[PDB]
Write a protein that binds this ligand. Structure first.
Ligand SMILES: NS(=O)(=O)c1cc(C(=O)O)c(NCc2ccco2)cc1Cl
Ligand SMILES: NS(=O)(=O)c1cc(C(=O)O)c(NCc2ccco2)cc1Cl
Lengths: 832, 831
């Protein structure tokens, strides 16, 4: 593997302009020990983030290529996106940092040669604009060029830092005008001072140093391909942070022991005999610093930001090295950030940003993404001063690192993916501690900008929480949502008591979900968010071709159920007939306590023109649903289409456990039937109108129906009319067995060859039930004609007590021409 | 309803800070700043009131505990978080009110002549004694809790009436101090902001926020209302409206009545003299000099009896302070232990369970009492007032911020039980309120805010998965049930194609109490990578089936959740085992969580059992294969080199034979694996087949120890094993050649399962292969933790069930735990 390549790229990202152009003021403002402290703290947080991103790279997404899929699925759909935004924005503003550094170095280069000084902020702005022009011109195309240029340039950078540690080794009297002393002992003692002359504090110089150590995420996940991408990249990058920390400590100590804080650029201010009062760094010598305690100093350590780069020997090589380092870091940042934006746009967790992904050229680079990154980077370039801008970039890098640490901690704690340890010091608690320390430290720097950072993080969490995108868990890593669903189902199965909640769970026995859409919508009304709907389908046919047909039907009808705004589980079964497959579904479907407890059938509207064997299976389906204590709900809709305008009439005619009252109430809460007034109809005696009405009203207050009105009807149990019974017997006539007219042997033959014939004996035996059904239909047409939905208790009979033709004729006569009617019968156990 | 809970809420909110500190606050801060402080505290309290109003209007009829309301509406995690924070806030607020009462008592002693010691220590001793007497009243005060509160409210309104009457009554003795009734001349000097001795705008707000607290404690905590859905919103919100405006009124009247600098001395009664005095002190003649140059002792700044100086009949006003403070303390000491015991009974904190127990007429926690009134005395030791007040303010702000953020989070993420339907509620209002609470939480104190942030974050981390690991703790099914709904829908909506294959097992063992080791072995390779459904076919009468199935389901699910098994007990009712297994294979599971493999224990004692049962058990194999399922036949011994998991790969069945050992290895008990993969290949360059199988293994991430290629299969075994097999199958063998044709025909049609001599002659090579494989397993794999071999398979009706089970018994005769695995041709590197 190219541990060499990863090392050189991570180094070149760290070894930028903040590496060696500001450390002079870092040690001049603070001292030796305090600079060592800030370097060590930046090292601690950087190595915690390095261990975190090492845990990202080596395991959990070892096979997975690319940064963003790994950071998303190996962590969580929520956690990856925020990291992407903040770290991309941090790179975008780092571009501004490094071009400002190049610009101020160019200003210093021009100042000595130029006879006059143009506006300094304007000079920095125009030079930075030109540098970003070169940056984009390089970043249009080419990656092997940077892959070689990094190895080309790291040697020159090491030569530059060697020139720093060697320029003091050669002293010179011409170097004495500037306050230069060669590795003297007094300088280190002078510079080991904990609080110093500049008003800025410790956390200020912490911000001034911190972005230099940032950028380690580039080689771990942002880096892609480059031969071996795993199992040795973490060790190489960790070694990179370690060696950068060692060289930072070395150069800080060397510069602190090198040069005194304030200096006078003159041959004067040298005292022949003054051993007392220690005016300069060299107390007995006092070569340079005198009379500049209150006067501004031209070439001071803290007063001049770049004195170490000017007083180092062979300084043109230093000047070239500054350009090389800052341009290399700028190229790295500006090839990173736009592709980060484009990657998050392509994954489209946030469709509001999705159009930024362009892929204009042969490479997938975003042209409009390049323009947007150019604009925002130049916007931060508009601030031509580096001292206050550097904390801003520090804030977003350190915040992104804190989010990475907390994401790694949450991934280790939850371990929804594989997420092996596969690392030394893989501990999640140390990552949590690093994240907390990062949060506090980010706060201490620029409390207002920090508060805006928490605001942005909370807003990102707010957006990603309510909106669940089928991006990474949805594509190629469905194991995450599978395990979440499995864990939630196991948790649900752990509840001890089920008697508290009836929880209406429906098994809709409609074969084709695309067919009968209004009935599926009506079922979805009462089970949308209160219960489980399972749209069963019994596929009969050859068993050899059964499995492929069932699979393709599952795919197609599940796509249909998801496309329409429904929450249904398509469950297909293979059986010889309807009854066997329905038995399969009713006794076996569901997981744990997500098992259907009501059976929902559509009214068989073609029972007149269908074979009576199918009607027998329909009625026996009613009966063996009642055997398993299911609740039968029969829906008869005009399929040529529901609108809620006035009322939803409920006809409480039987105590079925309260299902026929529970379903209408669940209809009201869906905001489609919000403007619908429940008007319960009950059957009581004329003398008992007040008692029944009052008790029923209290019973609804127990169901919390909040009835509009309750009307008691004495019209039931009367002879319906001459016409309606005529129509009923005309409906019966094709299936009626006229045993009176036929001979007894002929009647027995016609009964045995077709046992579904309705006879004259049980027609007169069940006369009162038939008259009750017809009378109820008359009352429905009179009182419930203007109603959105009608709910009544469906009639039942003992198994074999009635012919199937008679039972379906009762169901047809009861619901003849009404609006959508919902005949409900429930198991006798209470639903409260 | 209104007056039942308004009295309690007004007693709670009108506390110690109404009387002694309001004058001081409107002295340090101007009247404009006092109005700003009271108004913005009112904004915070009203936002919390709308949040808790939505919480109460969430659709459950009556919840006893307000914490339990938070729990059933938002969830166990947030419910526990607000419960703990609010309980601690009430516990420390009890100490605050005790310190306030002790302050009034000690400064009344200073009003009198008797003073035992320095007033600072007198605060400590009086606070301790008052904690003792409040314990004496606290244990059982049912008549004091209900009957005395209306009297206390009457006394409090009486006291505020005397305050107004005192504002409207000038007197000569009030003239040396600051007292000028409702005049602009001192309103001019008093309007200005005059902060003194390190005081800031947020510090006076930090001590003022204790006054506007406990809006939940007054009415919502008790949970005894005629209309809990509707009276709770009107009980609190209107109370705030009848509270804070009264506050504002005082903030005006004091600012209009008493001067910012008042000399207690009677010496500086200036004669009517022509002196300018641009300061408002001499606008009316009395100078109030030398109290601003030197330390002062009166005038909204250096005294707190200035409000008592305003009001006549000062015993009545002092009784007003006493009644208000003790009523607030009594409300807090009732609120906190009840919520704390509800936390323990909800089992969110297992270590806290010892606090739950209590005895009495109504069960109350004595452990909670002793801990709260111990930490109260711990805060009594800090006698300094404006240091106690900020930490109670911070903790109440923590409770309110957590409430608002949790309500907003439940509204945002579309939580399952979220239909509040409150008259005027907005989720954005709650979010803004939580943000404002966090900001003003920080600004008043940084270390306290940091400690609160770190403790609530640690609590959130603890309740993430450590508590939902086994027992999440919610006794309400809904927050679980509907939740799984979306997740199963979250599983159903994804287009998995055939890319995602997971081991989804349908174990067929009727009694999970029997064969626990087999269930553990199945759980080993399906713990976190698939679905495991233990299925039971209940045989018996149909009439008593449902109750028997319900009892068995409850018992076996409790057993499966007690032992660390993640399984679903799925019972089906059928006449025979084959029909129930067909039910479970066809229909069990929902969405993408449907069984993919069939797990069958090896039918030991099949020699003793009737051959019809063996025939049905064998027909289970052929039914599973038809529905395209995978069959594993574990012959784990039920009595319970080095550690090794041997894999004999003799057939290409979709890689399940290799997938099962890999899933075994990624477990704690099988961490040491040393997988040895044996394969049968014809005699050739062995290394070719070895490296091809090695590449196929490296696809599976198996980390093999060695692939051994053995060609000793397909040879005649030893004669001992063959005759042993012959004696095994002898009782079930129809010797058609030995006997006559018609006896054989009678025995065949009577017993179709009899194995003929023709089946033995046809399948001689297969039988020899099975018994030779058994010899090879004994020779090569005698010492191993697990053996996994491809399952023998025959076409339907080709072999008798006796011969088939004799093959399965001969193959696995005296071996370690052996799994005979056959899979559908699906899992070709798809996992
Ligand atoms: N309401 S119905 O009688 O016309 C009806 C109709 C159907 C239906 O076929 O849609 C159905 N599904 C079972 C099935 C058979 C073939 C495919 O699915 C069930 C019923 Cl009850
Ligand atoms: N693996 S087995 O053949 O010995 C077996 C064994 C059992 C078993 O009895 O545990 C079982 N349960 C079904 C049942 C019927 C009546 C009671 O349970 C099913 C099977 Cl396949």
């Amino acid at each position: 593997g190219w541990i060499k390549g990863v090392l050189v790229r991570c180094m070149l990202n760290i070894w930028g302009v903040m590496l060696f152009i500001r450390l002079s003021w870092i040690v001049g403002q603070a001292g030796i020990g305090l600079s060592v402290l800030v370097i060590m703290m930046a090292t601690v947080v950087t190595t915690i983030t390095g261990l975190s991103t090492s845990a990202i790279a080596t395991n959990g997404f070892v096979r997975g290529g690319g940064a963003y899929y790994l950071i998303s699925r190996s962590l969580g759909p929520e956690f990856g996106g925020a990291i992407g935004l903040i770290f991309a924005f941090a790179n975008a503003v780092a571009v501004a940092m490094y071009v400002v550094g190049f610009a101020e170095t160019v200003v210093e280069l021009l100042k000595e040669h130029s006879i006059l000084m143009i506006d300094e902020i304007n000079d920095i702005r125009i030079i930075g604009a030109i540098t970003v022009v070169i940056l984009l011109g390089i970043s249009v195309a080419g990656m092997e060029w940077e892959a070689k240029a990094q190895i080309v340039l790291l040697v020159i950078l090491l030569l530059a830092i060697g020139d720093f540690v060697i320029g003091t080794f050669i002293p010179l009297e011409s170097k004495k005008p500037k306050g230069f002393f060669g590795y003297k002992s007094e300088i280190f003692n002078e510079n080991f001072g904990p609080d110093f002359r500049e008003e800025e504090t410790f956390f200020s110089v912490f911000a001034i140093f911190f972005p230099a150590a940032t950028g380690i995420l580039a080689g771990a996940n942002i880096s892609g391909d480059l031969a071996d991408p795993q199992s040795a990249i973490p060790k190489g990058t960790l070694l990179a942070i370690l060696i950068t920390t060692l060289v930072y400590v070395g150069i800080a100590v060397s510069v602190g022991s090198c040069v005194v804080r304030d200096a006078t650029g003159n041959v004067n201010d040298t005292i022949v005999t003054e051993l007392t009062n220690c005016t300069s760094a060299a107390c007995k010598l006092n070569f340079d610093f005198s009379s500049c305690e209150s006067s501004p100093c031209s070439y001071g350590l803290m007063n001049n930001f770049q004195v170490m780069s000017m007083v180092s020997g062979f300084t043109p090589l230093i000047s070239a090295g500054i350009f090389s380092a800052t341009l290399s870091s700028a190229l790295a940042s500006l090839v990173s950030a736009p592709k980060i934006f484009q990657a998050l746009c392509k994954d489209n967790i946030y469709p509001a940003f999705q159009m930024f992904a362009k892929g204009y050229g042969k490479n997938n680079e975003p042209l409009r993404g390049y323009i947007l990154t150019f604009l925002i980077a130049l916007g931060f370039i508009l601030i031509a001063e580096l001292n206050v801008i550097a904390p801003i970039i520090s804030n977003f890098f350190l915040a992104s690192y804190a989010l990475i640490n907390f994401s790694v901690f949450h991934a280790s704690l939850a371990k929804s993916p594989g997420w092996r340890p596969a690392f030394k010091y893989y501990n999640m608690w140390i990552s949590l501690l690093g994240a907390i320390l990062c949060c506090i430290v980010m706060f201490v720097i620029n409390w207002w900008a920090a508060l805006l950072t928490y605001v942005i993080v909370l807003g990102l969490y707010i957006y990603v929480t309510y909106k669940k995108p089928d991006v990474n868990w949805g594509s190629s890593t469905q194991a995450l949502t599978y395990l979440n669903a499995l864990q939630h189902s196991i948790r649900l199965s752990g509840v001890e008591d089920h008697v508290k909640n009836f929880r209406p769970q429906c098994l809709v026995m409609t074969g084709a979900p695309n067919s009968r859409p209004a009935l599926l919508h009506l079922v979805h009304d009462f089970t949308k968010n209160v219960g489980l709907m399972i749209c069963g389908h019994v596929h009969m046919g050859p068993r050899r071709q059964a499995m492929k047909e069932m699979s393709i039907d599952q795919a197609k009808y599940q796509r249909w159920l998801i496309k329409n705004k429904m929450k249904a589980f398509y469950a297909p079964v293979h059986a010889d007939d309807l009854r066997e497959g329905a038995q399969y579904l009713m006794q076996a479907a569901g997981l744990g306590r997500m098992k259907p407890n009501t059976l929902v059938l559509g009214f068989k509207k073609d029972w007149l023109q269908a074979d009576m064997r199918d009607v027998d299976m329909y009625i026996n389906l009613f009966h063996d649903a009642f055997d398993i204590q299911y609740g039968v709900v029969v829906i008869r809709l005009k399929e040529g289409l529901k609108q809620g305008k006035n009322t939803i009439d409920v006809w409480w005619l039987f105590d079925d456990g309260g299902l026929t009252l529970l379903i209408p109430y669940l209809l009201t809460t869906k905001k489609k039937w919000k403007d619908c007034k429940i008007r319960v109809f009950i059957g009581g005696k004329i003398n008992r109108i007040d008692h029944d009405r009052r008790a029923m009203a209290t019973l609804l207050s127990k169901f919390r129906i909040d009835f509009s009105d309750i009307m008691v009807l004495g019209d039931i149990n009367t002879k319906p009319k001459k016409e309606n019974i005529i129509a009923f017997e005309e409906i019966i006539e094709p299936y009626r067995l006229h045993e009176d007219d036929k001979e007894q042997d002929i009647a027995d033959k016609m009964k045995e060859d077709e046992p579904w014939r309705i006879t004259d004996n049980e027609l007169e035996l069940y006369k009162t039930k038939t008259y009750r059904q017809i009378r109820l239909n008359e009352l429905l047409k009179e009182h419930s004609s203007t109603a959105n939905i009608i709910v009544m208790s469906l009639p039942v009979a003992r198994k074999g007590a009635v012919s199937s033709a008679l039972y379906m004729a009762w169901l047809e006569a009861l619901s003849k021409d009404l609006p959508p009617i919902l005949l409900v019968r429930g198991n006798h156990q209470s639903v409260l």
